[PDB]
């Protein structure tokens, strides 16, 4: 399912929230959205690693990487496993990897950067917290939408006009 | 008619003053020259609306949005008008949106990042004032150039060499 | 010969320093590698001009333009001149010009911005000294691999696993 | 500022009376000068070729066709022509935008309205003779007009 | 928590016993309750479907048709199936993620483990009789899998 | 430092002298050395591919079957000679970059100076006798060049 997010923030003015312009498109699909499912980490996409092999029907992982410039939280491995388990897409507040594959990836992924050092996985992180990033608090069982426009949140499901 | 702008800086080093460079190319046409026209104005497109609604051809309609990032101040229909009344293009101090409609819009347009939200139109702004923003002044009457390479003004009108 | 940065990372972690993420693709070449050769300058292009008309085989040129964005060091002629006498590619600390022909170029150019003003030469300019910029320390006869991805430094010549 | 029934009072032997078939439409009720003609149809690339020019002393007298499919001036044009000077436009054929030409410093005479734009392909012929609503209309001779008809004069009249 | 000897000998005249191929993989070792069937091959498109819908009180027979070249039951859905209130699942196939799912809360009997997953077509049919293994498996009626065996009755029966 | 008039003096048995048709254009003056051997012609692959190589008490003759049509060698080649200890280069054609050639510490004697260089392909042949100029050049033989000539011997010469 595509999104226009310019139509969603005229269909629903009171509804919509706008992230901070700072985010990028790397993914093969332009636009997702769906249910927010949170990860709060550092530098350790651990978490990142567990939510990809679970089913993602309907859903947007929201990455709280704390936007570190230092490592990437995802790359081609784990958006792929994203894709085939349905996952409508990823937002992560740091950095990716593999963005030739993932631009080729049935996935939509925004991030701040893309970073080829990985990460250290140590299992540290929080799963479904609400997380606080470019202007925005993102909640668990709330929606997000993401498109070459932006990103936007809603606290109830959106349909498009 | 296609400008490149290492070409004019070249011929007339006396004449030009370069943008700071922190504007990307969004429009159809990636390159874009011309008379100026100012707008002052901020999170109210009011003016944009009445402008692109003249004529255009030979002129660039610079506009001066105090760089907000929490507004769009032209979209897809705004954009379309424009090119059918000849406008060579349109440089934002600000957001604009439909980036992938204005993409494939017979018009050049550089702007600051894209936003979806909507702005709400109160006729506020100000027409052909002087408008300073990036390091440079924009002076009604005065000539603006911009390619892939950026933004170029001269207070005379440039041929290309 | 291609380079997959996030490879390098995984393969030598103790060899490898990661550049900050501030830096872009802009030639028709998007992966690139080889030794390091250095010139710190600043707003004066005069030993980019020389090293280009240089064999570059197996080289990179790192030049250090101290990141200013009011001038461009490298342009089209250059590029199709380090392209021809074989440099694998050029990283500039500064910005290059002529986008659209260095897209369409046989080398690797990473750069900070586009900016149409050219330079003045004027011979003002360090050859293989130690520069520094982005984090990182890039020494002549070290070397330096740069993709989509990022920029990675290595004391030792590395090989794609 | 023109009275028609004034002019057709003074120079009976030049007047002719344009059939009664046009209403009027722009801010100036009255209006009159020089013809510059237009033959077109259902498509006004001459039309905004001409408001653009200095038009002084001036009607541009648009032949459409007699068209009520689509429009042949707006607001647009119509600001052009009464900021270049034209004392007036008459469009056998629509108009658009007439709320804004209702208030614009201009005189608009025309058939209808009609919301519709035309295609603009550079068709269009430029100070040729024109004939319609029972009157040729030559380049170079006048018209006037107001709130009770159109008329035509080989030669310049002076309001009594 | 069910006793299959048990069951047997306190309804000999309702159960019928699967012929002992089965291994348990589960975190439960026992389990039981309404059959809700699957025909499918080497596609496990409505496994997944059937464990995003709340199974308390129910057992998913899963007919793989016995190939032992792909598995149809996985980690994921495994955990899909234990937190939906699913009983257990029986495949007449493979399954794998062995070590995870003996310890999720759910009871997994199966012929074999394969490491290999299948290329999902939505191919299968939903609640139609299947027969493996002897038995007949009819959804609406009742299975019961233990250490001991699985059993089969068309009725309810309660733990002596 | 040779002086081919010297050498000439010295060894009459073992010297033959080039036909008068070449020019000096380097640094150097007098030079020579070791003979190495290229045919080639309007293609400068293998005059790059030695170059690059260690050339101390070398000289690298260039049969570019005397072509005023391109240039041969230019000032990169030639820095890269002279950073790589060539004593000299010798090219039957054309080389350019005369002024900066010049100034490089480097033997180099041709026909004539031609700007336009030419496309690489990698045609030619290392290491094969190469016949110009009234002078059969053998890889391993001796080459010594002045302002007052070019000879060549068999054996290697010692300046008086």
Redesign the interface.
Known sequence: MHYV??D???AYPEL?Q?V??MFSNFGGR?SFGGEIVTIKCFEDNSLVKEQV???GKGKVLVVDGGGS??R?LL?DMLAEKAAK?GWEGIVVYG?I????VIAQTDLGVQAL??????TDKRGIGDLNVAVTFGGVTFRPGEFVYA????I?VSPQALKMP
Chains 1, 2, 3 share one sequence.
């Open positions: 997010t310019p969603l923030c005229d919509v706008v901070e312009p332009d092999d679970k089913d410039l230092r990437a790359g388990n950095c990897r593999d963005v030739d950067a893309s970073h080829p050092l990985k498109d070459n426009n932006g936007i």
